[PDB]
Design a protein around this ligand. Sequence first.
Ligand SMILES: *[C@H](c1cccc(NC(=O)c2ccc(C)cc2)c1)[C@@H](C#N)C(=O)Nc1ccccc1C(=O)O
Length: 110
Amino acid sequence: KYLVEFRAGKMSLKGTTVTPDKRKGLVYIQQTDDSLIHFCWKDRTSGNVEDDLIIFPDDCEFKRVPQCPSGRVYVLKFKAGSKRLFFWMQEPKTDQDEEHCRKVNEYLNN
Ligand SMILES: *[C@H](c1cccc(NC(=O)c2ccc(C)cc2)c1)[C@@H](C#N)C(=O)Nc1ccccc1C(=O)O
């Protein structure tokens, strides 16, 4: 099972052009027996996990990006490495989109 899970796709930079990934993916957080928190992104179509990163408490911060008019975009900033990942909610309703973001932040910071 997962502490938190929601439908969201990833994004990539095509040089100087921002381009969203049309592939459907599922973002979820799982806790291993070692008490570590793993942030993963899996393709719904293939069911394979392409992203697997180990995140420690307060290690990263998840926050909405005001720079995107959509308002459905959230970014994960890595304190160590300055790594940045962009995700966009795929749920039809935006009412619960904010709730999912908050839950993710709590697990990452707690
Ligand atoms: C926010 C974002 C903000 C402004 C513009 C865009 N995308 C496009 O302008 C665009 C135009 C045409 C085509 C074919 C695709 C895209 C996006 C979000 C979203 N959605 C985003 O993806 N931003 C993003 C992602 C990764 C890195 C940087 C940025 C960024 O906007 O700077």
